[PDB]
Amino acid sequence: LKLWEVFKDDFDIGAAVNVRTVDSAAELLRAQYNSITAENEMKPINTQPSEGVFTFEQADKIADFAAKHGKKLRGHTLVWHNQTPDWFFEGKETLLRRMRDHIHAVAGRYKGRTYCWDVVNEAVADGPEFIVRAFEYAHEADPDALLFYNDYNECNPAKRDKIIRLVKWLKEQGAPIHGIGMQGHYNLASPSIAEVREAIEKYAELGLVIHVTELDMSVYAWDDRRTDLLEPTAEMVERQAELYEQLFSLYREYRDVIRSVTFWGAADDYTWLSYFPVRGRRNWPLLFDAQHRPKEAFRRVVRTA
């Protein structure tokens, strides 16, 4: 049984990949996912290290994998506060010009393969006119791609309201924004199911597509920073499987607005949570274990459909 096929009429089932996991998880990706996202290779510093110098080799590899095996391809990401090259800042108009040049080169290179784009990533703090123009330059570079705003902690009521205020203002300035990206970086302690449902309802009221873009279920609460666990406990697996079952049952309720659910990883053998916030720690946040075998969460999730 294959995850994507189980939910094929509900939403895409995607996985984030890098230049390593696109090879090590090749068989798992070919079978269980129908959508792929480049984890880091399409980010600004990895695509244009200096002005006028573009490095597409690593992102080309991930894009070629998707095209070869008929996988959909999410674009991530065109503009991001945390990882903007230092040369970008070395006048406000020159910044606009460099943003337009970068967007056209990256969105143009993968036009016809990237069907969507996280145009602006994490603009809300845990000026605003730059976000409108980023969407304008993106729609100019690829009029066929769906343009998303992507952010985390999207179910926290404080940050959620800021996100909604930002998107409505963007819509009121004529920005060609088509969807919102719920990053879905959750854990066992937070957020609750009701907090996710309340967020999905308020995000659907804007008339945009909803993508769950980077979903994972950390076993540690953000406070927990222990490093003495090499495998998850039975209750960790059980509570993770229960939350995943309720999450995908909730996603199916909003079938009509959610069009794709992407995990930030393919299997537990590589997850970014193993290096953030605690480096050298182990985490088990996906539906397949370190051997690309289905976990208890997989069994419970497919039974929701």
Ligand SMILES: O[C@@H]1[C@@H](O)[C@H](O)OC[C@H]1O
């Ligand atoms: O690509 C970013 C990723 O590194 C992190 O895991 O969550 C936020 C994303 O934008």
